[PDB]
């Protein structure tokens, strides 16, 4: 699998592929690895499917309980800290998962958490089997003076490179830009196909 | 000698359960009703002194973005019970993945109140709640007794203004009704009961229409209905 | 016949909760109010004899460098409750990484008091607290009841001088106010209540402005306001 | 009918906490005060009969080589509480490696007394203690209440001779004082209170100066002050 | 209504502790004293009927070959407490390898009695013991109260013949004394108290000299002192 | 007001222990004595109606093939206690491999009765037992009190016929005696007490001689002594 | 990774690098390994990221609770003793971390604690993958008669040598001098770049 | 190590060597492996030192508690049964010890207990590293019609053979004859040296 | 590491080196392995650093609690028995430590305890990596008719031989003579350097 998360000026963009295997044997050509975890932050998936979905369910539950108790959204440092403490209360029966949570509260963030609960701030991050490819292209092309359209084009070029050069990733890309103004918006697949055909990465 | 502990009477009445019900007659009045495509809650807000923070005092307390609750009686038992209802709803959202029926939630909360009715060495909850929200079935509206009794209503009330409101609602309530006229009927109900302070107030009102989430009104919109 | 244990009355009142109230009426008076960019606490300090160490007797007890507390009533229940509030705040700082809302802290402390209200075989806490501090929302100021009731105030008091102070504060309090004039108003409030010993004292006063930490005043600065 | 169990009064007083006080008024009197670079404890020793081993009867009981304790009230509760204070001090010496502040020790001991004040089915400790010793802060001198109330003093007393001593010490105590004159003042205090048996005794006296350990005096040195 | 459970009085006295005392006043009298290089216990043995096995009735019950015990009061509580003292002494012989001080043993036994004084739902032990033996320090002689109070004596007694014996021992006891004259003084003490049955009996007597073990006397030697 | 629970009297008596005694005075009488090389038990058997199975009604109940027991008082407490004595004897036979001393067994059974004397919320055992048998020491014969008091006798009794039997046995008992004459003396004892029904019965009698096991007599042999 | 802690006359200087890997695959070019643990002492990180951050959270919490109970700062011997007892209550499910805590109370200290909780006093210490390099240069150049500027220059030369000769360390150095007078001050990155360009270790 | 226990007519003789290793590396040339467990029986040691000393402490405690409860000494069958039940309540975290308890109650016994708690009666027994040597010489020279002096001479010849032909055993022999008449008497080392010089086993 | 403990006429002398490694990689040239455990006895360290320091903390605590309960110092047999029972209540999660406790109560002792809790009395003992060297020189030069100065000179010669012929030991020697008269006195390092320069073992 692969993930990507890119922080720019006043937004943060995350995207995954949708191919679940679960065997060698690619079994599901349309899964779901990008989740809305709250109204201003989301969470991606790059690990064992069952453990990752249980962590998504628990974090949806805990953040909704949080916002319903305090009427304020959770800070991104707080959600990564909570996720790190949860993953590190059990590490000798651990969750084989590589999580990545990003979102905006007063400034956009994207955080990475490994299977032992190591939280660390960075402006662009990625996890999964097809991770070094998207790190390569993000290192080569990424600038922090981009717009939202330039950011999502960079994301689509990244995940397209990972699909062309990796076996585990593949299938249709789904992308969701989360910003302070419009809130959590997941792009429809028709606009994503339009961006792919505009960039000329289709075959 | 007339049995003040959770045991039975020689006619067969639970006296501590009773005495907790007359505790919740002293509470703040509140009301709910179903309308055409949803359900609304309306809570009276008797702002006694001018020192209390007028905004953040809330009786309409959300359990989820699709189930809401408003209460009457002992406010500490209210807050603890609403917290238990929140964690029970979130455990259902963990386990079964979605909140399919609000009836499971109100039955678990009512059984939690029953457990303190039942055993000895603990007083019952002196608190009465109504739940509202939509689910797979539709717009629902429950009640919750200190005994644990639940009843699903089309339109109900709770608190000190019980009897006058339920008399107004057996007289004048209609089943399917648009939201503006329904909340006008609710304000007329609350004014019909609360004509002992010769002023109503600006209360707090909330609603949901199926497919949407909760729209708790601000201070400025509720004064336009008034 | 008249029920001295945590069970209900035939009108619906908790007698031991009353009796832990009116215990808190015997305590030392204390006060808090919000000002322009923060919140202040002012605690009376009735130094009775001349043997007691004048400096280290503290009623303004910090929970964190962004939440403070001052108390009234039974001082042992006060110290145990403040210790539980400290360890609860530090557990929130472990788990969620930062103290986002002070309301979670005061609700956990109030539910801890509720648990001893609820079950049998333990008395309630005979203690009443107010919490103050800033968070992501802003400057906050709570109260805490032996029942567990919390109320967020703009300006409140606690202790033996309850009624005269809250009368002065319904008469003369203004919302947004600089810190020097606000603490002058607070000393005038405490002098208005405590005119039965015909001398006020040198009290202890503390404040916080948002972005900063607690500046508990020394002995020398508070005498210049007096 | 007037509430003899750890529950509240209709004016809000803990009756068993009173009754564990006025038990501690029947105890043996004791005293402590701070001097120039340390703190001293002086314990009266009413040797009633001539059979009791005059040497090994000790009321000044060490908790550590830098914290000491002397007690009054029920002597069995005293011994159990001093043993808990010893194991708590040694657990702090395990966990934090050094005894940095004696205040943590007296607060844990006082919360241990609070735990039996709080719950039902156990009587409070009928015992009152004062702690003395030096730390990183300096020479400290606490008190301990059957309620759990602690107060840091410059100079205090405990036991049957409470009031006459504290009157002498509001009249005649000075802050910074050499050790010989301070213990002469303490013997004069104990003689001022105990003028009902028309003889004082040879009491037991102990001191510490910061940087040193405890020098409990023998029988021969205390007779030279007398 | 005058307080019959282990709780406090309004003057501050534990009435069940008193009532376990004055139970121990009904017991059979016993005595101990220190002599020149050791300690002796002397126990009266009121053989009432002629059916009871004259030899094997023992009230000199060894805890170890270097600590002995004689009791008075309720004999079942005596036997249970002596069994607990035996297993506590043997646990100390496991853990610390030798019995260095008998004071740890008597303090653990006294705290065991304190635990049933303290909590509710259990009566105290109606039993009073004195311990004797040598250690690293020397010949020791303790007492044990149903309250848990211990006192180290040069010479003491226990049982029904308390007051007359302790009067004889404030009148006529000397500190350092050979064993034959000391046990003659002890028999004279027991005869001074027990002059109400106008015959003493043949009692049972035991001793230890430091470096040796217990020499409980047979029937034939004790009749030669008599 | 006169204390019916396992707590103390103002003179120092356990009233429930008395009331469990005087319950055991209503039981069936029984007896034991030592003879030349062993010990015998003799149990009266008041066969009231002619419907009860004459053979299988047993009061002499074996604990082991070298320790026997016979009881009086509440027969259900008797059966439960004899079952606990059996499993305790068999646990000793597991752990220490042989039953060296019967005294450990009777002391564990007596401490089991003490545990229900001691704690609250359970009544004592209303049952009184005597144990008999041989060991490494020799023929032993104990008694067991509802208080837990044990006494080793040469010859004793238990049940309703206590006083008349123990008067006969202070008058006429001899120490070393052959078995036939000893059991004739025992039948004469039981006839001396039970001369109120003007007929004795055919009782059940059992014995052991050291080196052998229990020879409970049949119906035909006991009628030849009668 | 690498750490360094140097005690001089009336101050103690600690610094780490900022590069987190978490894989082989250096993933985060700007992490955080130097933490303010109290107003007069700090703590560095040279172990597994999740376990180390959980230990930082717990020690921040415990020292703040401590100072809030007693109104006195914790001694450095006390914080190392507490950390040693915590790490040695669990060593068969241990934290794979090499901690180093330094600070000043009445005299400056820097202490080292391994994964089994061995506390030991020393005047200069270091932990991490790039540790023997900075021990070499500290052994060769270090004197106890240095000033604060000479100390922080020695620290920058040390960590620059570790970056030039190690793979695991790298990225921008951050340094914080903790002294009794000014309290905990972390140097801004502009002054650190000025010191690097003055010493001429830039390329 | 080595032990020996010999039952004769009206006495039982036990002896060990005194050399404790605890490493390969013989470390203590004067230990203690022969213990008085009661006034009429003793216990020898041939196992792991810590476990064996803990078992000696526990059995001293239990037998003293026994005699103090019942005023009778414990039978030898009873002490071996107790020791067997104690060692067999825990055998999957076992004590690596080979115990041997002997004494006289109404007839002399010497019993052997392995690490799993197998008690077995025999008239002569031995345990330890240097055990088959003393079994050889006891099988070749032992008769049950010996006196106490002949018995202790046979014991000294046995342990001297084990010292001359084994590495683990060595050091000065200590012997204690336990009989019904004189009770537990441990022979002084001067008499043991006199018996060695009389038998001519010295070099 | 190395330790040494020597009993003479009316005193007992213990000394260790100070070099802690904690890796291969000697890391701390000045540690602390000689501890005052009570006013008349001390304890040395030759094991894993964390476990050994936790045992030192616990035994300081327990002996201080002991003396404060009974107003008598603990016997040396009692402290070794307590330490043996503590180490043998847990041996399947054991402390990898080789302790050595010595002191004087009415006669001087020095006791050795391995990781399984085997206590054994001896007049001279040593533990650690550099142990057989100091056992060699103690066996060759030691006599029980020495004075305190001759004893501490023998100790310094021993630990100097262990430093010259072992890698794990090293650094400055610290020595503390504990006697009945002066109590626990640790020698200052200046006197130790004077004794080294007098014996001529310096280079």
- Following DSSP, what letter does each residue of C116-148 receive, concatenated? HHHBSSB----EEEEEEEE-SS-EEEB-B-TT-
Q: With contacts defined as CB-CB under 8 Å, which chain E residues touch H62?
A: 90
List the end-to-end C-alpha distance of chain B, in Å, as a whole number: 51
Number of Cβ atoms within 10 Å of the Cβ of E125: 29
Task: Show which residues of H are catalytic.
Answer: 1
> How long a stretch of residues is chain G?
203
Q: Of E95, E101, E107, which has the smallest distance from its Cβ to I72's Cβ?
A: E101
Residue D167, Cβ neighbours under 10 Å: how many? 14
Is residue E115 a contact partner of residue D44, using CB atoms and an 8 Å limit?
A: no
Measured CA to CA in angstroms, residue E32 lies from B174, E28, E36, E132 at distances of 95, 14, 14, 8
DSSP string, A95-134: ----EEEEEESSSEEEEEE-TT--EEEESEE--BTTHHHH
Q: State how far the Cα of A129 lies from the Cα of A42, in Å rounded to an integer.
A: 20
Chains A and F touch (3+ CB pairs under 8 A): no
CB G4 within 8 A of CB G160: no
Report the alpha-carbon distance of residue A186 to residue A170 in Å, rounded.
Answer: 19
Q: CA of H63 to nearest chain I CA: how many angstroms apart?
A: 19
Q: How buried is F35 (Cβ within 10 angstroms: 0-12 exposed, 13-18 middle, 19+ buried)?
A: buried
Closest-CA residue to C121 (of D1, D122, B81)? D122
| Spacing of C-alpha E66 from chain mean position | 15
Contact I15, I153 (CB under 8 A): no
Element (H, E) at I36: strand I34-38
| Structural domain count, chain I | 1
Q: Token pair 């097809």 is at which residue? A: A130
- Give me the helices (H) in chain C, please: 15-20, 75-95, 102-118, 163-172, 179-193, 219-225
In chain H, whose CA is at the least distance from the CA of F135?
Answer: H72
DSSP type of residue G48: -
* Phi and psi at residue E31, to the nearest 5°: -155, 150
Helix (H) or strand (E) holding G140: helix G131-141
Instruction: Say which residue the tokens 């001899």 belong to.
Output: F174
d(CA G40, CA G103): 6
H64, H66, H72, H184: which to substitute to probe chain E, counting the most E Cβ within 10 Å?
H64
Local structure of E82: helix, strand or coil: helix
Please name the residue ranges forming H helices in chain F.
15-20, 75-95, 102-118, 163-172, 179-193, 219-225
Distance CA C136, CA A103 (A): 17
Phi, psi for residue G56 in degrees, rounded to 5: -65, -45
Which domain covers residue I24, as residue numbers?
1-203
First to last CA, chain H: 21
Q: How far, in Å, CA of G172 to CA of G16, rounded?
A: 9
Q: Report the distance separating Cα E47 and Cα E199, nearest Å.
A: 12
Cβ-contact D51, E130 below 8 angstroms: no
Three-state secondary-structure class, residue F182: helix
Phi/psi at B135 (5° precision): -150, -160
> What H or E segment, with its residue span, contains residue G112?
strand G108-113
- Cα–Cα dist G83/G66, whole Å: 14
User: Do residues G51 and G113 touch, judged by C-beta distance below 8 A?
Assistant: no
Residues 63-102 on D with a CB inside 8 Å of I are 63-65, 83, 86-87, 90-91, 93-94, 97
Chains A, D in contact: 3+ Cβ pairs under 8 A?
Answer: no
Beta-bridge partners for E69: E61, E131
Active-site residue set of G = 1
Residue C191: strand, helix, or coil: helix
Q: What is the distance between the alpha carbons of residues G195 and G197, in angstroms, rounded to a whole number? A: 5
* Residues in chain B closer than 8 A to A65 (CB atoms): 86-87, 90
Q: Which 3-state string (H, E, C) describes C39-59?
A: EEEEECCCCCCCCECCCCCCC
The angle subtended at Cα A67 by Cα A63 and Cα A70, nearest 5°, is 135
Residues of D in contact with C52 (CB under 8 A): 151-154
Residue that the structure tokens 């029966």 belong to: A93
Question: Which residues are CB-contacts of E119 (< 8 A; sequence separation ≥ 6)?
Answer: D121, D122, E6
**Residues of chain A contacting residue B86, judged by C-beta atoms under 8 Å apart:** 65, 68-69
Angle at which helices E163-172 and E179-193 pack, to 10 degrees?
140
Tokens of residue D173, six digits? 């105590």
Q: How far apart are the first and last CA of chain I?
A: 21
Instruction: State the best of C24, C50, C53, C84 to mutate against chain D, taking most chain D CBs within 10 Å.
Output: C53
B/e letters for D97-130, b = 16+ CB within 10 Å, e = fewer, are: bebbbbbbbbbbbbbbbbebbbeeebbbbbbbbb
**3 state SS of B11:** coil
Helices (H), chain E: 15-20, 75-95, 102-118, 163-172, 179-193, 219-225
Provide the resolution (angstroms): 3.4
The answer, for A118 touching chain G at a CB cutoff of 8 Å, is yes
Nearest chain I Cα distance for residue E147, angstroms:
20
I1 catalytic per annotation: yes
Q: Which two tokens stand for residue G116?
A: 């089994």
- Type and span of the H or E element at C10: none
G67 touches chain C (CB under 8 A): no
Q: What is the DSSP letter of I187?
A: P
Write a three-state SS string for chain D.
Answer: CCCCCCCCCCCCCCHHHHHHCCCHHHCCCEEEEEECCEEEEEECCCCCCCCECCCCCCCCEECCCCEEEEEEECHHHHHHHHHHHHHHHHHHHHHCCCCCCHHHHHHHHHHHHHHHHHECCECCCCEEEEEEEECCCCEEECCECCCCCCCCECEEEECCCCHHHHHHHHHHCCCCCCHHHHHHHHHHHHHHHCCCCCCCCCCEEEEEECCCCCEECCHHHHHHHC
Q: Given the DSSP bridges, would you call strands B127-134 and B67-73 parallel, antiparallel or unpaired? A: antiparallel
3-class DSSP assignment, residue E61: strand
- Rounded CA-CA distance I196/I158 in Å is 12
In chain I, what residues touch G125 (CB-CB under 8 Å)? 27-28
Distance CA F162, CA H176 (A): 55
Residue of C94, C100, C101, C134 to mutate, testing the A interface (most A Cβ within 10 Å of its Cβ): C100
- F101 phi and psi angles, rounded to 5 deg: -135, 130
> Which residues of chain A are within 8 Å of residue C103 when distances are taken between CB atoms?
69-70
Backbone angles phi, psi at A72, to 5 degrees: -140, 145
- For residue G54, give the H/E element and its range: helix G49-70
Q: Check: CB of residue A154 under 8 Å from CB of residue A140.
A: no
CB atoms closer than 10 angstroms to residue D31:
29
**Interchain contact, E154 vs D51, CB within 8 Å:** yes
Q: How far apart are CA C120 and CA D6, in angstroms?
A: 12
Among residues E131, D89, E64, E101, the alpha carbon closest in space to that of I73 is found at: E101
Size of interface G-I (CB pairs under 8 A): 48
Terminus-to-terminus CA distance in chain E, angstroms?
A: 50
From A63's Cα to the closest Cα of chain B, the distance in A is: 10
- Tell me the sheet residues that pair with F202: none
Nearest to E176, CA basis, from E31, E69, E39: E39
Give the torsion through C-alpha atoms of D201, D202, D203, D207, to 10 deg.
150
Three-state DSSP class for C15?
A: helix
Size of interface D-I (CB pairs under 8 A): 24
d(CA I92, CA H93): 8
Question: Residue by residue, what is the 3-state secondary structure of H123-158?
Answer: CEECCECCHHHHHHHHHHHCCCCCCHHHHHHHHHHH
């Amino acid at each position: 699998t692969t993930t990507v998360g890119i922080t720019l000026k006043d937004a943060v963009i995350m995207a995954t592929e949708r191919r679940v295997t679960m065997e060698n044997f690619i079994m599901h050509k349309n899964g779901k690895k990008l989740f809305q975890i709250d109204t201003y932050t989301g969470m991606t998936i790059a690990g064992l499917v069952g453990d990752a979905q249980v962590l998504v369910r628990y974090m949806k539950a805990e953040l909704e309980l949080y916002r319903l108790q305090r009427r304020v959204n959770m800070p991104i440092e707080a959600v990564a800290t909570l996720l790190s403490n949860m993953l590190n209360q059990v590490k000798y029966m651990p969750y084989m998962v590589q999580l990545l949570v990003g979102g905006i509260d007063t400034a956009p963030h994207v955080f990475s958490i490994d299977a032992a609960g190591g939280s660390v701030e960075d402006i662009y991050a990625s996890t999964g089997s097809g991770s070094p490819f998207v790190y390569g292209v993000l290192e080569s092309q990424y600038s922090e003076k981009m717009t939202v359209d330039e950011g999502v084009d960079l994301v689509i070029r990244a995940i397209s490179a990972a699909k062309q050069r990796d076996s585990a990733s593949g299938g249709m890309i789904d992308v969701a830009v989360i910003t302070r103004k419009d809130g959590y918006v997941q792009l429809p697949t028709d606009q994503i196909e339009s961006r792919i055909r505009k960039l000329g990465l289709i075959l | 000698y007339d049995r003040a502990i959770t045991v039975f009477s020689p006619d067969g009445r639970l006296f501590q359960v009773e005495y907790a019900l007359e505790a919740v007659k002293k509470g703040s009045t509140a009301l709910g009703m179903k309308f055409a495509n949803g359900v609304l809650l309306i809570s009276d807000k008797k702002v006694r002194s001018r020192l209390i923070e007028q905004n953040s005092i809330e009786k309409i307390q959300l359990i989820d973005d699709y189930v809401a609750a408003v209460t009457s009686g002992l406010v500490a038992d209210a807050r603890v019970l609403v917290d238990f209802a929140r964690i029970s709803a979130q455990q259902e959202k963990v386990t079964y993945g979605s909140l399919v029926n609000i009836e499971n939630l109100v039955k678990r909360v009512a059984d939690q109140m029953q457990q303190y009715t039942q055993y000895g060495g603990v007083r019952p909850y002196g608190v009465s709640l109504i739940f509202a929200g939509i689910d797979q079935i539709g717009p629902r509206l429950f009640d919750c007794d200190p005994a644990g009794t639940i009843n699903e209503y089309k339109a109900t009330a709770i608190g000190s203004g019980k009897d006058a409101v339920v008399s107004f609602l057996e007289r004048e309530y209609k089943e399917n009704l648009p939201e503006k006229e329904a909340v006008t009927l609710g304000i007329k109900a609350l004014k019909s009961s609360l004509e002992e302070g010769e002023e109503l107030k600006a209360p707090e009102i909330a609603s949901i229409t199926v497919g949407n989430k909760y729209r708790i009104y601000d201070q400025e919109e509720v004064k336009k209905f008034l």
